Every structure is written in structure tokens, then in C-alpha cells.
From Swiss-Prot:
Belongs to the CRISPR-associated endoribonuclease Cas13a family. Keywords: Antiviral defense, Endonuclease, Hydrolase, Nuclease, Repeat, RNA-binding. Pre-crRNA processing is metal independent, while crRNA-guided target RNA cleavage is dependent on divalent metal. The active site is at H399, R903, H908. Residues 846-1007 are annotated as: HEPN-like fold 2. The target ssRNase active sites are probably within the 2 HEPN-like folds, and the 2 folds interact in vivo. It is an enzyme of class 3 (hydrolase). GO terms for biological process: defense response to virus. This is CRISPR-associated endoribonuclease Cas13a. CRISPR (clustered regularly interspaced short palindromic repeat), is an adaptive immune system that provides protection against mobile genetic elements (viruses, transposable elements and conjugative plasmids). CRISPR clusters contain sequences complementary to antecedent mobile elements and target invading nucleic acids. Unlike many single-component effectors, this CRISPR-Cas system targets RNA. CRISPR clusters are transcribed from pre-CRISPR RNA (crRNA) and processed into crRNA by this protein. Its cofactor is a divalent metal cation.
Length: 1007
RNA sequence: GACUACCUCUAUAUGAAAGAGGACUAAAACCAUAUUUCCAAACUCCACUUU
């Protein structure tokens, strides 16, 4: 009934299999027409739907089995006649059986008034039980008198199971044998031959639109005192209008279409099945607006018709289009899409070296200074013909077609024109790549030297973590699509170990998830050491061993389905076979997660596949760390003798110099742009079939790992970024601007020797430095004050944080202190002291500039991700016309050269070249001028602005669109709240601050 | 319903096309950008925001 598909039938699952011949209801891994007998088993649930179609909201438990046992012979159960059935039977039925119900048999000879049958179920049920004279009910006698009702349900079930079964077999790909698909096929062919497809005013007169919208407004301005049911009785006045003009609704097929779109208009603004939440407007119902919208959302279906079989010509697939073949295109257009937006951000970085505004105008002194930040080496004066032409040949060599991914990462040569090609082997770049590879065992040590680690652990306790046999501190990290991050593993693992022990205990037998207190340096040693033993030593081995991975899944499944009752959530996901690779069982987990994405959101149910992937990886990291002797990490214990014994670590790699161009692209990316690329690459790698071409991807997925070790080296000396103290003091006075620069946080230890700031050089590496000098120079309350350093001495935060943890733990034993009006104010003042101290600490070290830089990149890279779908749709509708160019496309009102200007500067990152032109909120306004192509992509442009800012701790409101001449303008920007101590209280705290939010708005609206 | 989607099929035009389907089409979710929110467990089918 409700779910035909995605439902068990014979302890087997059900899928649909669309095809150009028709539709098919198939089991799971098979290919047979089983739509006849899947639909036959799906029939005890049709009886269960009719019983809930004849019974009411106080779902009574004695009328529930009287009705159900008439329909099912086996289901009938003995009940008493008189005592349990003596109520108001008329007040327990449905709202459809309260009054007499009339119908015609399914296959009646013809419509007539002598065929329609009458039924009063409240009358016909009282007349039988008085004729029932036994102590208990007799099924043979009762069924015989209820014969008038049983034929209603057998008619109801048998006709609905015929409508669903025809809705499936005709649901084919790109149908033209149907009504309203043949009609859109008629309209599409009358535009390529440049004609007019339809006329609104001539079809508005046959529909008699003015007889409607006058009766619709009447039903709106008439009564409707109660907000509930207003929406239901605009449906019935619309069903009344169709009834009087039905004689030509069956005879036109274009008039009929006019009714389907105006029906669909009504249940999106005056909803009936769509979670109301808002009072309707009378503006929508007015005549001349609905006709404008019908013109607007019927052309949407013509443009979607053109692109959807222009896709079937770019692949050579338009006769064998299959449901299975279509999915395969969805996947390889995700790896190819994520790979493009990385090249647009790497190409931006190559712009700022050469010419930020192409080879002729080079600032010569800036180039060498810019080169030393990406690459840790130093270039000569005589190499800028071979370095600036050598990098561009790594990014340059979008056509959405059949890709062959071998000879896509190789690229042996690059050309230099004044044309004379070089290899990358007899070049200066070769020395850089090899130098990086042979310094891996000391880049680990400097990552260990920093963030304590060596100051809290002894060197004998570190020579037995890189010395474990079968683990070699790889640069590879996983061979699986859905693996967690480490902070999801360690934080959620704290939740399973530390648990109340006062329950139906769900023990996982964990021991290493000990602390959570981030305020110490002892814990930040073991957190940083666990982090790198779970990424280099453990993730590669675990993911490729069949026995190690399987032994953790088999503990998890048998921990769940071995306790009493039926409520067991890991019920329908199967156990790992023997001789099965872990990249083949976790491709089963990924596919189940994405087929059940809609069924889990129709009803309010949680994603139970997420908390399965946690517990396997949480338990398996404990079994690793205890089978070896690696359990001393849980006790740091700061040492006294600085031990001068070396930590010798073994490492060997077979990377040849065929990767010496893709490494030059990964050195121009970020640290977040690199991690995301690697996650999409492991999804696309786990669906390919060849034994080669996967070794292409696992050799480039190791180049990314080598790039990550460096990441944020930056500078170390002082006078390599500046020349004098007066140029340092000129630049740094744009953010603090005082006589405060000769102090402790801003000079080294004594005298006048400076210190360089890690969030300020980072802005300079990228091109966002100019923008942030315009932001902080608008006001003067943005810079570091003398009172902000003065607040960092008012008191200590360690004695306040401790107080908060103590007061919170007492609330678990005494929840009644939530209504203690004196206690809840003391807890409020402790939170606001921790909050105000942490904003002043961040402001003093200029950490926020780092936050502003990250926030700006996310907004401009999302906008470059809509301009790549629009570019893919432009070449999908153009190559269809050239197979049958501009004079047709400017008759379809598609891509102009006024919108190609807007689509080009969004994609080419032209916001960052200093001078503004137009703000950020005028780039989201320009994105939905290009994407007015369809509503699916236009409606989502503003939906993704609010999601990005909401992840960074902020809300946003956006004034109504008809008042602002269709532009985006801010109403309210406010810090988002956390709601300490329960869910129905007033004790809360802002996620960021009111001061950070003001800075953010002055960035979004800044011309 | 810009946020607060969309598109294919389906007709005894009505207890209603108020029905089914979408990894098939978009957006999220997942991912190596520090820390305050108690936590863990909670099967399937069928209903359900008016009357």
C-alpha cells in the first residue's frame, strides 16, 4: 500500500528496474519480471490498510478485530457478543463511514443510478449483533450478514492493486507512448522550428479561469475564522470547478495539462499534504498571477525535456538506456565534479604568482617571496621561464564523456613557447620531489617535537610504535568508502566506555577512551599521539586485512542480536562472508545507506547505518591497541630528563617519477581541499572493475598523503617576509594599531625583536589578504584594544571551567535544581565568564582572521560549484541542436553573453583581485540569474548560503523577496544558541559572540 | 511556499490523480580546519496535521 518498493517480501528486498520498454518490480540482484507475484504477496497489507480505513483515531482494540477477521478467515478470534460490543458504534467508525457510502462495482456494465449500492455500516452492524444470540459471536452467521460490507473491501483492494500495477509498467524512461509526454514532445519540436508552442489567453478561456479565482477568493474571504481546514476546502471548490467542465477536459490533452499545473500550484502554496507551518496569502489566488505562473512552470518541463535526452546523446546509450546504466553516470559525475573545483582553486593560486590582475607584467621581488611559501626551497633569478611554464603544464592538461583514467595522471612533458617541449625529469622540479620523499622520517619527528609528545613520553616508548611488524607508517590512509575521522572515533568512544551502569547494559568492552579534558597539555600529548597511530600505522592494515576487519564486524552484530525482545536495530544487515575483501562489504553498506535515504526521512527515523560504522571502527581500534603493547599512551606522566636518544623509524616507498606533475598540483591546494579530494577518490575507486586503473588511483592517492605532511610550514625566520622593522610595524598596525606592538605577545622575549603571526602570513599565502585589509579598516572597534589584553589578567579560566564541570555533574543527580531560581543564575554567570574570556583570547592572537579567511573560501567555492552544472547543461542543450546554433538558443531564451559574463567571474574567483565591483550577496543574486534555466537549481542557491553560515555558528534571515525587487538583503544576523541544562529552560549561551557576527555582516555587504 | 525542493507515471475525475516511484535529480550526510549541550539502548507492517 504505502511502500510497494524498499520493503521485505519473502525475507528478500524489492526494487524497481526502469527501462525504456517499461517498468519492472525485481528483487535484489536478479533480473526477472516478478511484478505479478511480488504484488500478490503484497496483499495482507492491503487488508491491513482497509481496516485502518474503516476505523477511527481513538484506535479501539475490540472493533479492530471484528473488522479484520471478516476479511481474513484465519484472523477471526472468539469475542463476546453483548458486553464488549455495546458502545456507540457510530462514534468509532471513520469520517467516510459516518454517513451512508455509495459506489459502483469495479466492472459495472455502465454508469447508472440502479447499479450504485448503498451501505450504512452503523445501521447494518447493529442489525446483525441483535440477531446474534450465542454467548460468543458465531463467525459463519456473522460473515453471512456482513456480506454487503465484505464486497466493498474486496472491490476496493482489487481496483487499487490494478492502478498501482499499471503505474509501474508504464513508468519507463523518456516515454512518448503516454498522454502528456506526447504533448511535451509536440511542444519541444515546435521551438527548434522557431514557432509559438501555446497561447495562454486562448486556453484560459476554455478553462474559464475567471469563474474560478472569484469563488476561490470567496472561500478565503468567506468565514474561515478557524485556520484549520481552510486548505481542505479550497481543494473541494477546485474539484467542483473541474466537474462542470469535464466534457472537454477529456478531449483536448493541452486543456487537461492546464488543469494539472494549476492543481499543482494550489498544493504548494495552500498545502494539504506538506506540513503547513505558515498562514497563506490572498496575493497568490488573484487572476493574472496564476496565468503568469502556469506560463512559467509549463516551460520548465520543456527545457527539462530537452536536456534529459540531450544527455542520452552525449553518451552512446539512447537505445539501451537502463536504470542500472543511469546510476553509473551519477557516480562518475561526482568524482569528475569534485576534481574540477580543485583545479579552479589551484589555478587561482598560480594567478597570484604571475600576474594578479599575462606573463609580461611580473613583480620580480614578489615572485621569489611567494615561491618560498608554497615550496620550502629557494628559486634563483634565472629559473622563471621554466618554473612559471612548468607549473601551468601540470594543471592544464571538463569534457563530460567516456574517460580512460590511465593517461590522465601521467603527463610526462610540458611545452615552453616564445614551442619546445621538455621532460619533467631533466628539470629542477625533479630535485624538489625527491628531496620531499627522503625527508619523511624527519617530518614525522618535527610533528612529534611540536605539540609536546617527546616532552611527555620516553624514546624507548616510541621505538615500539613504528617498529611493529606488518605496519610501516604508510602514506595511504584507507581502502573503504565510508571511514570516520579520528575525532569522531575518539569522542564517540568516550560515550560507550563511560556509561551509567544502571541500565539494560550494552557493553562493548572498551578500555582506551579515558579522558575528554582538552584544557591540559598532558591530554593534548596523548590526543596528538593517538591521532597519528590511527592514520599511518592502523588505518591501512585494518582496511586490507580480511581477518582483522571481519573479526570486528562479527563482534558488533552478535552483540546486538543476542538480547531479549524484538527491538534490535541491526536486524536486516547481513554478516560478512569468508574470503570477502573489506572494500566489498563496505560497498554493500554504502549502497544500503543511499537506497534508504528517502524512507528514513518520510517518517522521523534516524540513520542507523551511521552508528554501525562507528562501533566497528571504535572496537577495532581498541583491539589493535591492546593486542600490541601500546597501552601506555593512556598515562602521559611528564618527564624530567630530556632524553637525547633518536627515534629511528623505517619507511620505504615505490613512487617513481611519473607523479611529478600531479604533485605540483597538490602543492597549490589547501589542507581541507586535499582531504576532501582523497575521500571522493576512494568512493570512485571502489566501483571500478579493471585490475589496472585502480593502481592508477592508489598511486595518486599516495601523492596527496605526501603533500599533507608539509601543509602549513610557512616561515621560521623574521626578515624573510619583511625587510625592516618599519615595514613589519606598518602592516601589523592594521590589526592592533597601537603602542602595544612592543610587548610580550607581539615581540620575541626582550628588546625589540619581533615575532611572526601564523594566521597573518597564511592570509598572505592566499589572495584574500587585500579583502581583510578592507574589512578591519572600516571601523576602529575591530582592532585589538588595550582593555582586551587587560581582560586576560582579570582572573584565570582554569578555575572557572573546573567550576562549570562540577556544577553540571550535580544536575545529573538533582534535576530539581533547574527550577531553583537562585542556582540557575549562578550557573549562568559561570558560563558567561568562560564565553567572554575565550573571545578576548582569540582576538589578541588574531585567530579570527583565520576564521574569516576560511568562511570566505567556502562561500566562493560553492558558487563555483553551481557554475559548473550550468556549464554542463549549456553543452547538453547545444550539442542536441547541432545534431539536428545561437539563433535557436536565443529563441529558447537560454545562455546569452550577458549571463556568460556572470558565470565567468564567479568561476574564475574574480572577487579576490582587490577592487570590489559587487558584494558577496550580489554573487548569490547573480547565481540565480544564470540558473533560471530550471527551478530545481534556482531554489537551492539561497538554501546553501544559510547552511554554510549555520555551520559556522550563525543565523540569517533575508527580508521578503517581493519587497526588495528580487534581491537578497539581510534582516537579522545573530549568534546561534546552545541551550545548556535541559531543553525547556532559559539557561543558554551564544556559540560565537555578538562581536564576531557584526564583522561577518560587514563582509557580506561590502562593495 | 527563495529559505519552507523538484520530475516521471497513474483517471469508475471519486472518500478524491488527497495514489505510487526517484543512488534514475538536486540539496544535504560522510571527509585530518582544537575545547561548555549529559550519555546508551530503542525490529517490521499499517495509520496520521479537517470534518
Amino acid at each position: 500500500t504505502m511502500r510497494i518498493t524498499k520493503v521485505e517480501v519473502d525475507r528478500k528486498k524489492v526494487l524497481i528496474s526502469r527501462d525504456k520498454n517499461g517498468g519492472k518490480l525485481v528483487y535484489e540482484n536478479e533480473m526477472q519480471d516478478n511484478t505479478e507475484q511480488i504484488m500478490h504477496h503484497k496483499k495482507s497489507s492491503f487488508y491491513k490498510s482497509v481496516v485502518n480505513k474503516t476505523i477511527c483515531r481513538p484506535e479501539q482494540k475490540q472493533m479492530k478485530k471484528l473488522v479484520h477477521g471478516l476479511l481474513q478467515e484465519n484472523s477471526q478470534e472468539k469475542i463476546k457478543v453483548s458486553d464488549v460490543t455495546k458502545l456507540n458504534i457510530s462514534n468509532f467508525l471513520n469520517h467516510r463511514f459516518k454517513k451512508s457510502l455509495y459506489y459502483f462495482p469495479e466492472n459495472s456494465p455502465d454508469k447508472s443510478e440502479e447499479y450504485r449500492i448503498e451501505i450504512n455500516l452503523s445501521q447494518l452492524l447493529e442489525d446483525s449483533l441483535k440477531k446474534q444470540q450465542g454467548t460468543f459471536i458465531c463467525w459463519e452467521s456473522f460473515s453471512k450478514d456482513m456480506e454487503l460490507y465484505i464486497n466493498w473491501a474486496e472491490n476496493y483492494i482489487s481496483s487499487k492493486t490494478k492502478l498501482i500495477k499499471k503505474s509501474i509498467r508504464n513508468n519507463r524512461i523518456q516515454s512518448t507512448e503516454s498522454r502528456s509526454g506526447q504533448l511535451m514532445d509536440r511542444y519541444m519540436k515546435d521551438i527548434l522550428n522557431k514557432n509559438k508552442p501555446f497561447d495562454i489567453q486562448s486556453v484560459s478561456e476554455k478553462y474559464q479561469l475567471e469563474k474560478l479565482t472569484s469563488a476561490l477568493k470567496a472561500t478565503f474571504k468567506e468565514a474561515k475564522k478557524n485556520d484549520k481546514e481552510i486548505n481542505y476546502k479550497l481543494k473541494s471548490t477546485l474539484q467542483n470547478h473541474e466537474r462542470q467542465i469535464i466534457e472537454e477536459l477529456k478531449e483536448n490533452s493541452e486543456l487537461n495539462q492546464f488543469n494539472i499545473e494549476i492543481r499543482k500550484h494550489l498544493e504548494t502554496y495552500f498545502p494539504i499534504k506538506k506540513t503547513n507551518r505558515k498562514v497563506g496569502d490572498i496575493r497568490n489566488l488573484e487572476i493574472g498571477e496564476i496565468q503568469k505562473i502556469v506560463n512559467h512552470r509549463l516551460k520548465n518541463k520543456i527545457v527539462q525535456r530537452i536536456l534529459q535526452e540531450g544527455k542520452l546523446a552525449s553518451y552512446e546509450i539512447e537505445s539501451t538506456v537502463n536504470s542500472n546504466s543511469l546510476q553509473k553516470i551519477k557516480i562518475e559525475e561526482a568524482f569528475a565534479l569534485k576534481f574540477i573545483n580543485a583545479c579552479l582553486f589551484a589555478s587561482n593560486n598560480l594567478r597570484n604568482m604571475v600576474y594578479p590582475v599575462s606573463f609580461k607584467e611580473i613583480k620580480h621581488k614578489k615572485f621569489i617571496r611567494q615561491w618560498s611559501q608554497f615550496f620550502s626551497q629557494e628559486i634563483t633569478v634565472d629559473d622563471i621561464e621554466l618554473a612559471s611554464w612548468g607549473l601551468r603544464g601540470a594543471i592544464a592538461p571538463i569534457h563530460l564523456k567516456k574517460h580512460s583514467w590511465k593517461k590522465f595522471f601521467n603527463n610526462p612533458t610540458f611545452k615552453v613557447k616564445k614551442t619546445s617541449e621538455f621532460l619533467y625529469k631533466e628539470t629542477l622540479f625533479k630535485d624538489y620531489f625527491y628531496s620531499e620523499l627522503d625527508s619523511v622520517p624527519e617530518l614525522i619527528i618535527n610533528k612529534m617535537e611540536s605539540s609536546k609528545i617527546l616532552d611527555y613520553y620516553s624514546s624507548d616508548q616510541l621505538n615500539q610504535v613504528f617498529t611493529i611488524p606488518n605496519f610501516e607508517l604508510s602514506l595511504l590512509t584507507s581502502a573503504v568508502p565510508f571511514a570516520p575521522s579520528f575525532k569522531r572515533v575518539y569522542l564517540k568512544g568516550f560515550d560507550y566506555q563511560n556509561q551509567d551502569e544502571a541500565q539494560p547494559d550494552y557493553n562493548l568492552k572498551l578500555n582506551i577512551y579515558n579522558e575528554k579534558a582538552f584544557n591540559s597539555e598532558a591530554f593534548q600529548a596523548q590526543y596528538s599521539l593517538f591521532k597519528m597511530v590511527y592514520y599511518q600505522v592502523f588505518l591501512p592494515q585494518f582496511t586490507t586485512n580480511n581477518d582483522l576487519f571481519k573479526s570486528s564486524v562479527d563482534f558488533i552484530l552478535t552483540l546486538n542480536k543476542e538480547r531479549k525482545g524484538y527491538a534490535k536495530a541491526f536486524q536486516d544487515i547481513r554478516k560478512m562472508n569468508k574470503d570477502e575483501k573489506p572494500s566489498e562489504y563496505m560497498s554493500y553498506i554504502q549502497s544500503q545507506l543511499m537506497l534508504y535515504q528517502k524512507k528514513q526521512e518520510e517518517k522521523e527515523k534516524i540513520n542507523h547505518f551511521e552508528k554501525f560504522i562507528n562501533q566497528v571502527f571504535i572496537k577495532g581500534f581498541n583491539s589493535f591497541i591492546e593486542k600490541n603493547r601500546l597501552t601506555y599512551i593512556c598515562h602521559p606522566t611528564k618527564n624530567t630528563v630530556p632524553e637525547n636518544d633518536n627515534i629511528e623509524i623505517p619507511f620505504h616507498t615505490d613512487m617513481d617519477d611519473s607523479n611529478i606533475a600531479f604533485w605540483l598540483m597538490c602543492k597549490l591546494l589547501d589542507a581541507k581541499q586535499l582531504s576532501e579530494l582523497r575521500n571522493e577518490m576512494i568512493k570512485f575507486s571502489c566501483s571500478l572493475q579493471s585490475t589496472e586503473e585502480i593502481s592508477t588511483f592508489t598511486k595518486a592517492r599516495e601523492v596527496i598523503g605526501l603533500a599533507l605532511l608539509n601543509g602549513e610550514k610557512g616561515c621560521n625566520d623574521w626578515k624573510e617576509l619583511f625587510d625592516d622593522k618599519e615595514a613589519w610595524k606598518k602592516n601589523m598596525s592594521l590589526y592592533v594599531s597601537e603602542e602595544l606592538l612592543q610587548s610580550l605577545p607581539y615581540t620575541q622575549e626582550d628588546g625589540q625583536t619581533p615575532v611572526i603571526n601564523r594566521s597573518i602570513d597564511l592570509v598572505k599565502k592566499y589572495g584574500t589578504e587585500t579583502i581583510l585589509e578592507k574589512l578591519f579598516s572600516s571601523s576602529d572597534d575591530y582592532k585589538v584594544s588595550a582593555k582586551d589584553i587587560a581582560k586576560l589578567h582579570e582572573y584565570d579560566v582554569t578555575e572557572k571551567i573546573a567550576q562549570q564541570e562540577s556544577l553540571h555533574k550535580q544536575w545529573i543527580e538533582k534535576p530539581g535544581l533547574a527550577r531553583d531560581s537562585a542556582w540557575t543564575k549562578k550557573y549562568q554567570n559561570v558560563i558567561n565568564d568562560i564565553s567572554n574570556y575565550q573571545w578576548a583570547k582569540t582576538k589578541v592572537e588574531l585567530t579570527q582572521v583565520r576564521h574569516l579567511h576560511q568562511l570566505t573560501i567556502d562561500l566562493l567555492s560553492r558558487l563555483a560549484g553551481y557554475m559548473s552544472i550550468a556549464d554542463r547543461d549549456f553543452q547538453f542543450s547545444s550539442n542536441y541542436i547541432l545534431e539536428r546554433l545561437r539563433l535557436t538558443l536565443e529563441y529558447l531564451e537560454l545562455f546569452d553573453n550577458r549571463l556568460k559574463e556572470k558565470r565567468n567571474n564567479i568561476s574564475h574567483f574574480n572577487y579576490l583581485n582587490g577592487q570590489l565591483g559587487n558584494s558577496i550577496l550580489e554573487l548569490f543574486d547573480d547565481a540565480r540569474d544564470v540558473l533560471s534555466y530550471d527551478r530545481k537549481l534556482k531554489n537551492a542557491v539561497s538554501k546553501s548560503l544559510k547552511e554554510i553560515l549555520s555551520s559556522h555558528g550563525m543565523e540569517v534571515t533575508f527580508k521578503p523577496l517581493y519587497q526588495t525587487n528580487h534581491h537578497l538583503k539581510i534582516d537579522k544576523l545573530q549568534p546561534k544558541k546552545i541551550h545548556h541544562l535541559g531543553e525547556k529552560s532559559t539557561v543558554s549561551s551564544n556559540q560565537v559572540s555578538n562581536e564576531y557576527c557584526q564583522l561577518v555582516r560587514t563582509l557580506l555587504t561590502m562593495k
